[PDB]
Amino acid sequence: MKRTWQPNRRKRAKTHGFRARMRTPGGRKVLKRRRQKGRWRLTPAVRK
């Protein structure tokens, strides 16, 4: 049956992307915390 993950590159970039995170106060805190933890990827990798 139809499962929950229905990948869509535009949806992924527009929802979790770098520019979405930089728009809001909450999103910038995400990047700050991910940079502070040392994450190799700050935002989900999506092709485009």
Which does residue 40 bind out of Mg ion, RNA, none, counting CB within 5 to 8 angstroms by kind? Mg ion
The DSSP output letter for 17 is S
CB neighbour list of residue 14: distance below 8 Å, 6 or more residues apart? 20
CB nearest Mg ion: which residue?
17
Residue window 6-35: x/- pattern of binding to RNA, with contact defined by CB under 7 A: xxxxxxx--xx---x---xx----------
> Where does the chain break, by residue before each gap (C–N > 2.5 Å)?
none
Residues near Mg ion (CB under 5 A): 6, 9-11, 17, 19-20, 30, 40, 43
